[PDB]
């Protein structure tokens, strides 16, 4: 307990003698409690151009620790042996061609400069001086400020912990360990436009249905056993690298100190997965791959209830299954953190729930022992929040595109993050959403129309600033003043590995829409008179926005 986290706790309490009290009214049943201390907008452009969505409930809803505080039952001994053998095989497989390595101050500095306000932090040598400090400490087996939360110098300590984590484990993302080519099941770096093609390729594999089971609170279900298995990547590092990485796992993952928000609370726990940590996506992806392989093994009859309870379980059958079929089984899945799609060899997988429940990965909103429902159409499978619709262009070429309920897209676009933002900043974020819709959601009639209206409304030279999403699947091709059709051709034709015919598309007229029935099923307002009124009266609203923005140069895209 205290040896590992004590120093971290002492600095906060000593620094906060101004108000350090122990509350006996603290609601912490699972996390350890140490003490606490006292502490202290709609996007108008988009809203004006989407009047019909002013009513829609999902749009209004978006404008406006209960699960974290639980314990996960320890997995059984046989399960623990199976997870261990599987983790060792997977880590060796992921490391077959790549070697782990330390990440550097330069790499981290360059990432920050192109992604706030830590830019000022990385430009000051004082920041790097303290980092050299937890590092000497993180190297002797201790950390003193390496803590996380759920114009004060405390910010430097937080950013410092993140850099130290990046230095030790950033190579998983920086060297693409979870790319599809390296990991087989991974989709890191593919991007949203490619996920649909990946599911369609998965559907070609012979087998049973496609399963996409959601886990309830995945981060809260990461056990002490999962963390031990995740740490096995350490055996592949160089001694200098092994020392720092071991420090990150032992002192910040296997032990943690957190701050929650009026007053602030200091709590600690030896399990669960940290919120903002750098290795979270990669470690979650690795653990999900291991669990899904284990579920496939149970599905094939390789693992039984007796095997899960057996403390003296023999490795040979697991090693043989992994060695002869493990890569093929990995190839049947698309896994991004807690999102997974699995196409097992047959439908026995639907009822293979002993190991999955035993590892703590309990499926959300379904009785624990009810069989999973699979899909026979890859187009109905949900993954990373999306539908993947397959489309035929007028020229006969086929595209695979992503659908999501239209109210979710319009609702997000209508929200600006942060107050005190000028119209120019607001118009630019609107342009970013509009251009994102042109690139990814061009097949929705309402979004293409709203997209044309926003771009007509804002000055053509203006550069979209601010991100429309934090998703790891977003490549931000829409953050540009380059012609969107040129970008569309580059993304969907030129750089598209699934498009053999490279003939460019010269007009938006040749860029297809979803079928009218499907567009309506996915939330389109097309066919309602209110939509027709909006479409007819859109130029008037565009002129209204242009007049408020001022005398700048605009283009008509209707
Ligand atoms: C898997 O891709 C996503 C998942 C979720 C979301 C919603 C959000 O994060 O704001 C957006 C996306 C993307 C939109 C455009 C390129 S990625
Ligand atoms: Zn530390």
Numbering used by the authors: 272 to 311, 319 to 342, 355 to 405, 419 to 453, 470 to 580, 587 to 883
From the reporting publication:
DENV NS5 (∼900 aa) is comprised of a methyltransferase (MTase) domain (∼250 aa) at the N-terminus, mainly responsible for RNA cap formation during viral replication, and an RNA-dependent RNA polymerase (RdRp) domain at the C-terminus (∼600 aa). It functions by replicating the viral genomic +RNA into uncapped –RNA, leading to the formation of a double-stranded RNA intermediate, and then using the –RNA template to synthesize new +RNA copies of the viral genome. The overall structure of the RdRp domain consists of three main subdomains known as the ‘fingers’, ‘palm’ and ‘thumb’.
Furthermore, we obtained RdRp3 in complex with the fragment PC-79-SH52 using our novel screen under both soaking and co-crystallization conditions. The structures attain the same closed conformation with loops from motif G (∼405–420) and motif F (∼450–470) missing in all the structures originating from the screen. All our crystal structures contain two zinc binding pockets represented as blue spheres in the finger and thumb subdomains, respectively, which have a tetrahedral coordination geometry as previously described. The sulphur atom of PC-79-SH52 interacts with the side chains of Ala799, Ser796 and Leu511. The carboxyl group forms key hydrogen bonding interactions mediated by water molecules with main chains atoms of Thr794 and Trp795.
